[PDB]
Ligand SMILES: C[C@@H](c1cccc2c(-c3cncc(O)c3)c(C(=O)O)[nH]c12)N1C[C@]2(C[C@@H](CN)C2)OC1=O
């Protein structure tokens with residue numbers, strides 16, 4: 616009833632949307648992994664009379680439910696999707712999208728990693744993102760490669776019309792006590808990558824993590840802090 620939806624509030628298989636700003640929503644879904652349940656976020660950005668999707672809803676059935684929820688709540692067609700790294704919370708559901716008419720995109724690095732590890736593979740490669748600090752425009756967003764953090768391929772997304780920074784899994788929520796799933800992370804480079812985000816997007820008003828509650832710019836410093844302490 617208006618609060619940001621949380622893990623125990625979303626059964627696995629259902630999806631909820633949350634209005635972030637004019638023409639910007641997050642999507643929230645839940646999934647089981649190694650016997651625990653987790654929430655995860657993505658983004659939806661209005662692109663005229665179409666929608667740009669950022670990240671899947673962590674699985675094929677969740678992603679079908681996402682498309683249904685978008686049709687219910689927004690009623691504009693999703694035409695393109697970008698996955699912000701190669702893990703299943705970002706690409707699981709790409710096959711569903713691709714069969715529903717959505718053109719799917721990711722960096723070449725993400726595509727290679729997804730292929731190598733047996734995850735679903737976005738169709739189209741996003742060039743111009745291979746060096747830290749690179750940025751490219753993609754419809755109503757800017758895509759930015761900050762350097763290795765949660766993963767070596769992680770991208771962040773900025774919505775300039777609304778000053779919304781979607782950090783994906785490179786950014787943690789304020790309640791986080793740990794650096795999350797660090798299996799593929801670079802804990803040594805992560806603070807430097809966060810510093811690049813902080814420098815590039817000083818006017819961000821909302822910061823959205825890959826999992827958990829949005830907040831303001833403090834999510835970036837908090838992330839750097841928890842990562843440094845995890846490493847320590
Ligand atoms: C699908 C994703 C994943 C699964 C389960 C939980 C998380 C979390 C997470 C968030 N918050 C708190 C927390 O405890 C955990 C994140 C997060 O941090 O981005 N990601 C999660 N994968 C799986 C994998 C691939 C590797 C294969 N060897 C393991 O590394 C990942 O990042």
Ligand SMILES: [Zn+2]
Pocket residue numbers: 700702704765766784
């Ligand atoms: Zn991940």
Ligand SMILES: [Zn+2]
Pocket residue numbers: 702704784825826
């Ligand atoms: Zn994640």
